[PDB]
C-alpha cells in the first residue's frame, strides 16, 4: 500500500493501454509500443528502468536468430519457469489483425547490464485455438512435466459472417480449454460441463498443479459474473484429464492486475467492477496448498487524478510492484498524454 507518483522520459508517447512488462532476473522490459517499430529502435522492445521516479526507456536488441515480432496490444503472457522464459500468444497487431502464433522469448546474453534477447515463433499443431485476444494462458506442472492451459477470450466473427457494416465486431469464443505441449507445441481441445459463458479479461493463477480463474467480462450478456473457478489437471501416461470446481467467496472484476506479494499469497488491484463502476478497493488472495480464499485489504491511498479519472491500465513489474497509467484531462492547458503511478506493498 505504497502509492508513488512518477515522471517519465521524453518518449512518453510509446505507452498505450495494453502493453506487457517482462521481468528478467531483476531487469524489466516493456513490450507492445504504439505504432510500428520506429527506426530509433527496430525491435519495439525497451529496457524499462526507473531511478528516483525518473524512468529511461532505452532500446534493446535481439539475437542473430530471433523472429522480429510485431507489437501486440492485448496478448496472453505467462512466465514459463522451466531457463526462465516468457510465452506470448495472440494479441492485436497495429493494423488490427489478430495473431495466432506462440512467441517464446528469453535472454541470450546480458553482459554489464547490456541485455540481448532472443525470441522464437513456436507454432501450434493439431486442434489449434482460433486467433483471439484478451484471453489467458498459464503454465502448470504435474508429475515432473508441465502443460500450458489456455482459456479463451473474445475474437472477431468467423471468416464467413464478416460484413463491412459490422466488420470490427467481436464475440466471445466457445469456452473450451486448450492444453498445449510446448515440447512439441501440440494442441488438444477439451470441453467441460461446469463452464457455460465465454470469459474475457479474467485473472489466472497457477498453484503448481491447479489453476484458478477469477473475474472476467461476459460479453454474451454484458455482465461481470463473480464466478471463480478452480481447475485441477493431471497428465497420466496417455492423454491428460481436466476437472473443474466452483468455490464460494467470489468477486466481480474485469481487467484486473495481478502480482505476487508473498510466496503462496497474492494481491489484486483495481480493474473494473461495472462499466460505470471502477474498482478502488484491493483484495488480498490467500492461496494455499489445496484451498484458497479472498479478503478485502486496506484500500491503498489514491489521489485526485486516479479517484477522478474515468479509466486506468497498467500491469505488474514482477517484484511486488505495479505500474499504472491515467489518461489525464485534455480540457486544460494542454496536459501531457498520460500520467503515471507506481504501487508498492513491501
Amino acid at each position: 500500500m505504497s502509492l508513488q507518483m512518477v515522471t517519465v522520459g521524453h518518449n512518453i508517447a510509446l505507452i498505450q493501454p495494453g502493453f506487457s512488462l517482462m521481468n528478467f532476473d531483476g531487469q524489466v522490459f516493456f513490450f507492445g509500443q504504439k505504432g510500428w517499430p520506429k527506426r530509433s529502435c527496430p525491435t519495439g522492445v525497451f529496457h524499462f528502468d526507473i531511478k528516483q521516479n525518473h524512468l529511461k526507456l532505452k532500446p534493446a536488441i535481439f539475437s542473430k536468430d530471433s523472429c522480429y515480432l510485431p507489437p501486440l496490444r492485448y496478448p496472453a503472457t505467462c512466465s514459463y519457469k522451466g531457463k526462465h522464459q516468457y510465452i506470448i500468444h495472440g494479441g492485436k497487431t497495429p493494423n488490427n489483425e489478430l495473431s495466432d502464433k506462440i512467441y517464446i522469448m528469453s535472454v541470450a546474453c546480458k553482459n554489464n547490464k547490456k541485455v540481448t534477447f532472443r525470441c522464437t515463433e513456436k507454432d501450434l499443431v493439431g486442434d489449434v485455438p482460433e486467433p483471439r485476444y484478451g484471453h489467458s494462458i498459464d503454465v502448470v506442472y504435474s508429475r515432473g512435466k508441465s502443460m500450458g492451459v489456455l482459456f479463451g477470450g473474445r475474437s472477431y466473427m468467423p471468416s464467413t459472417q464478416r460484413t463491412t457494416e459490422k466488420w470490427n465486431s467481436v464475440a466471445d469464443c466457445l469456452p473450451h480449454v486448450f492444453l498445449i505441449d510446448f515440447e512439441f507445441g501440440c494442441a488438444t481441445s477439451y470441453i467441460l460441463p461446469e463452464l457455460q459463458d465465454g470469459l474475457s479479461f479474467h485473472v489466472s493463477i497457477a498453484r503448481n498443479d491447479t489453476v484458478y480463474i477469477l473475474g472476467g467480462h461476459s460479453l454474451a450478456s454484458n455482465i461481470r459474473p463473480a464466478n471463480l473457478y478452480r481447475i485441477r489437471v493431471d497428465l497420466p501416461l496417455g492423454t491428460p484429464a481436466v476437472n473443474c470446481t466452483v468455490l464460494p467467496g467470489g468477486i466481480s472484476v474485469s481487467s484486473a492486475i495481478l502480482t505476487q506479494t508473498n510466496n503462496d499469497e497474492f494481491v489484486i488491484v483495481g480493474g473494473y467492477q461495472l462499466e460505470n463502476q471502477k474498482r478502488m478497493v484491493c483484495s488480498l488472495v490467500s492461496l494455499g496448498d489445496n484451498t484458497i480464499e479472498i479478503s478485502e485489504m486496506e484500500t491503498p491511498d489514491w489521489t485526485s487524478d486516479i479517484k477522478h479519472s474515468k479509466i486506468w491500465f497498467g500491469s505488474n513489474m514482477g517484484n511486488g510492484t505495479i505500474f499504472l497509467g491515467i489518461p489525464g484531462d485534455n480540457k486544460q492547458a494542454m496536459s501531457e498524454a498520460f500520467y503515471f503511478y507506481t504501487l508498492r506493498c513491501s
Binding site: 496490444r73 457494416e165 459490422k166 466488420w167 470490427n168 465486431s169 467481436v170 474485469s254 473494473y272 462499466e275
Partner: peptide
C-alpha cells in the same frame, strides 16, 4: 464509420 467497433472501458479506448 466505426464499423460496430466495440468500445467499452475494458477494451482499447
Amino acid at each position: 464509420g466505426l464499423s460496430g467497433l466495440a468500445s467499452s472501458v475494458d477494451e482499447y479506448p
